[PDB]
Curated annotation (Swiss-Prot):
Species for this entry: Homo sapiens (Human)
Stated name of the protein: snRNA-activating protein complex subunit 4
Record's function text: Part of the SNAPc complex required for the transcription of both RNA polymerase II and III small-nuclear RNA genes. Binds to the proximal sequence element (PSE), a non-TATA-box basal promoter element common to these 2 types of genes. Recruits TBP and BRF2 to the U6 snRNA TATA box.
Subcellular location: Nucleus
Domain Myb-like residues, every copy: 17-54
Disulfide bonds: none
Disease: Neurodevelopmental disorder with motor regression, progressive spastic paraplegia, and oromotor dysfunction: An autosomal recessive disorder characterized by delayed motor development and developmental regression after the first year of life, followed by progressive spasticity with gait alterations, paraparesis, and oromotor dysfunction. Most individuals have cerebral, cerebellar, or basal ganglia volume loss.
Subunit structure: Part of the SNAPc complex composed of 5 subunits: SNAPC1, SNAPC2, SNAPC3, SNAPC4 and SNAPC5. SNAPC4 interacts with SNAPC1, SNAPC2, SNAPC5, BRF2 and TBP.
DNA sequence: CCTGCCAGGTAAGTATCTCTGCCCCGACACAGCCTCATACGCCTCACTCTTTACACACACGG
């Protein structure tokens, strides 16, 4: 199996890929982003994720 | 060492085509005009099942 598949099978079961635990600064950043890219309702969560980490 | 007539069987006959050279040809190019007919080709449009993404919801379980 190529390195690609090994990394895939590791990531798909890597728990450190996502943080899983919320912190206050994460919340502050999320609120700021939502307010920046607000449209009313239905905030684009993808374009928000792509400004956050984990 | 030859030679032949007669009975039986058979048989007629009538009645009721594939090449092969060879002269005397059509159809090729190609010229402008010209009108309508025929063919091709290519991109834009349609659509249709089948996923593809993504915000949101809702048990679920102990």
């Amino acid at each position: 199996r190529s390195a690609f598949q090994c990394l895939q099978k590791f990531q798909q079961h890597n728990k450190a890929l996502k943080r899983k635990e919320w912190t206050e600064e994460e919340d502050r950043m999320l609120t700021q982003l939502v307010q920046e890219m607000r449209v009313g309702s239905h905030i684009p969560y993808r374009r928000i994720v792509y400004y956050m980490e984990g």
